[PDB]
Each structure stands twice: as structure tokens, then as C-alpha cells.
Design a binder for this molecule. Structure first.
Ligand SMILES: NC(=O)c1ccc(NCC2CCCC2)nc1
Ligand SMILES: NC(=O)c1ccc(NCC2CCCC2)nc1
Lengths: 237, 237
């Protein structure tokens, strides 16, 4: 179930951050994940390899120049063959969450278009882009970090890359006592069922306290309902 | 108003993605932004430079080993001096948005702790971390991409790095006609006020259609109320 991701970027060397390091670097070396980049600058024809252009209507910014970007996209589409979804990363896109990650991970091929400057021509979005996605409600200097974020997130779903809507439970490792703070005795008990229930209760409690809206989106099991009620009762002393 | 950011990461070379390229790369070269990394592996003492450890209570994963990570954090804190806020990036943190970015950008010094494996010891969060932040409701293989995302976002607020709660308007550049699609005539009119109002109306319309909840958080001006009503009337034909 390997995955191919084509990238359109003025700064393809940025993607070394995910292709050369850690779990995603291993995925690439083991051919579980392939990331292939095209740079609009390589598709320019003028002496100074111009990749930006002035916005109609004026304004302080520049846009990506249409012809080099369009040609790079077309080249990526030809390399991908049939079935590749083309994604543009921008704050105007659908907000990414883990459900959206699972949806995107169903694709065997993606092409990610990374904007720079003030963005890209709206008509390219209409004619070349299948979906717009955002990694969050904030503005960055380029689409490369959003693209890498998406790649990393979906790569976790590729079989072989790694070894319920709630926040994670607390985790502990050595030493047993750290600046006077002890490990919860249950985690030392060797009682697997008690440990499982403790972790679940902690996850429910943390989700309730920090992100209560996330709970509203869940259909809690009988056990989860019980443990959440216990946690809420204890919180209220 | 330059900014110093200390980073704790097992993969410091990942940060070349922001320190060597584009607007953030320029910020670094021009001394507007300094990014300084410490690697827990450099703080190990065993032959194999062990940086992970087993979780109490069992489970399939590993945590970052406490001693090398703690020592790296302390070294970063000493380098930062007084006033540095220590941030841990994780899905359990406060969700980043542009308002949160503006808040974080008020700090002259930040230290960003990048988790790997299944995370870090809860007691380190208690004893070493000032704030936990998330870049979005999804899970990544490491905190480095979230840290770089945060750095890029806050760097845009540093004076010299660059040259209202609504989504951006559409942008257009050459050519005048692209695959049969024309540039809106108003943007060619040279009428600056008409162009301003068009862009604002488009932003209001796009926010309403794609992200209506964002509108609920705004106190629209009289002009914005009018243009939004116009856009909604036109949408309803
Ligand atoms: N939240 C996001 O997913 C996101 C995506 C792209 C971006 N910036 C580059 C785009 C902004 C103008 C040029 C393209 N910033 C933020
Ligand atoms: N949404 C986020 O801001 C985010 C942060 C860190 C992360 N992964 C590394 C952490 C997860 C376990 C080890 C540390 N994933 C996602």
C-alpha cells in the first residue's frame, strides 16, 4: 500500500526534512513512501528565471507566475498518471483533522502544490486543483510546511511505516521519582486491566478538561461513560 | 524586535528547512531571527547514545529518555537567560490560530521542545514546560514540523521579515484569459476604491460560504455588513 506524493515547490530542498530523517526518512528509504518534487523555476524561459508576477488590481504583494507553475503541475500530473488527486495548501482550504488525514491516506497518489508570495491565480485553482486544504487557521510564508505536515500525517497510515477521538493519557518512564514527583502506582502494579482502565479514564478526563467539544462528537461506550463520570466526580471532589 | 528561538530536537537538521530558505531564511541571515538547536543525543553518556526509554505500565511504544532530554532543556534555558517561555508541541496542547500566533510573537525568546516516539514524561511537562500547544487536531511522527510551523508563523510578525479574521479574496495575474477564464473587469479598471470593496466583498462571501463560524466571531463594520448582505443576496440570485 505504498504511497506516491508529487510536490510542486520553489524550495524542494525543504522536503529533506521529512525524506532524510526519522520514521518518514525510513519510509522513504524502504520505498513505502516516494516524494518527487518539481520546481517551477525549472520551467521558466527568461534569463532571470522569473517565478513571480504582479497581481491585477494592484496591491503590495506578488503572485506565483502562472506559466512556470502551470507547466510544473502538468509535468507532475503526467508523471503521476491516472488517479492522482491535486491538492493546494492554503488557509482558505478545508481544515485538516485526523479524520481528514485518514481520508487523504486512501489515495495512492497525491500531488501537493506549495504556494509562495501572496498565492496563486484563482483560475489555476479552478482548472488544476482538485481540493484545497488547510493545516490550521494561521498564515505561513509558504505551503511547504503544510505539505510536509500532510505527508507526515498520512505516512503514519501506510502499512510498515510504524512499528478513538480522545486526547492521549499521561506517560511515564524512568526514574521512579523525578523532582519529588512519583509515577502513579497503578502503572507499576503489572495489572494490565487496571492499567488499561486508568489510561482510558485519564484520556477521558483530559479531553473533558482541555477539549470538551471533542467529547460531544463521540458516542461513548458504557465503559467510557462510567470512567468519565468517575473522573468528573473526583474533579468535583 | 528580533526573536530568539531555542529548539530541543533529535533531528536538528530538519530546521534547515526554515533557516536556509525563503523569507525565514532571509530573516535568519539578516539576524532578525535566530534559531539555536540542542540535541538530546549529545547529552547521553552510554556507548550507544540511547535517547528513548520504556514506558511504565507497558505498551507498544517508547518515550523520550528523561535524563538526556532534561539536560538539553536545562542547557537551552541557561543559554536563553531570563524570560524565555518553554513550549511543548503536542496534540494535547492549546490549538494554534492566528490570534495565538500574535500572542506567542510577543515573546522575545522561546524554547520549543520537539517530542519523538510516544512522547515525553508527564513530570517533565510539569517541571520544565510553561505551555503546551498544538498546530491542529492530527498526529505527526515528531514535534519538529509543528515547531517549524510555529516559528514560520511568528516570524511573519518580526519587523523587517516581510516587505481581519476573514479568508483571503481571489487573486489574479497574467494572462488576461486562462483556459477561457477571464480576470474580473473591476481589477482592470484602475478604480482603487471599487477594487478594495470588491476584494472585501469576496472575502466576506468566501468566509460565509466556506467558514461561516468564523463570521460569528467578528463584529462586522457597517461596510462589511452591507457587502456581506449584497453577496448573500446575489448568491440567492
Ligand atoms: N494554514 C495553512 O494550511 C497554510 C497554507 C499555506 C500558507 N501560506 C502559503 C500560501 C499563503 C499565500 C501564498 C500561498 N499558510 C498557511
Ligand atoms: N498537532 C500537533 O501539534 C502535533 C505535535 C506533535 C506531534 N507528534 C510528536 C508528539 C506525539 C508523540 C511524541 C511527541 N504530532 C502532532
Amino acid at each position: 500500500s505504498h504511497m506516491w506524493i508529487g510536490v510542486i515547490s520553489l524550495f524542494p530542498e525543504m522536503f529533506k526534512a521529512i525524506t532524510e530523517f526519522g520514521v518518514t526518512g525510513r519510509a522513504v528509504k524502504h520505498n513505502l513512501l516516494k516524494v518527487e518534487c518539481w520546481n517551477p523555476r525549472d520551467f521558466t524561459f527568461d534569463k532571470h528565471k522569473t517565478v513571480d508576477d504582479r497581481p491585477y488590481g494592484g496591491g503590495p504583494g506578488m503572485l506565483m507566475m502562472v506559466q512556470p507553475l502551470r507547466d510544473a503541475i502538468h509535468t507532475a500530473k503526467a508523471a503521476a498518471g491516472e488517479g492522482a488527486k491535486v491538492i493546494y495548501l492554503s488557509p482558505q482550504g478545508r481544515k485538516l483533522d485526523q479524520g481528514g488525514v485518514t481520508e487523504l491516506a486512501q489515495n495512492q497518489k497525491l500531488i501537493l502544490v506549495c504556494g509562495r508570495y501572496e498565492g496563486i491565480d484563482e483560475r489555476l485553482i479552478q482548472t488544476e486543483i482538485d481540493e484545497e486544504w488547510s493545516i490550521g487557521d494561521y498564515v505561513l510564508t509558504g505551503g511547504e510546511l503544510p505539505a510536509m505536515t500532510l505527508i507526515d500525517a498520512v505516512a503514519r497510515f501506510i502499512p510498515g511505516v510504524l512499528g478513538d477521538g480522545l486526547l492521549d493519557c499521561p506517560h511515564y518512564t524512568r526514574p521512579e521519582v523525578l523532582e519529588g514527583l512519583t509515577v502513579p502506582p497503578v502503572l507499576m502494579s503489572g495489572h494490565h486491566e487496571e492499567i488499561r482502565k486508568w489510561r482510558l479514564k485519564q484520556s477521558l478526563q483530559r479531553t473533558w478538561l482541555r477539549r470538551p467539544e471533542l467529547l460531544e462528537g463521540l458516542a461513548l461506550t458504557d465503559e467510557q461513560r462510567k470512567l468519565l463520570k468517575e473522573a468528573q466526580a473526583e474533579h468535583n471532589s
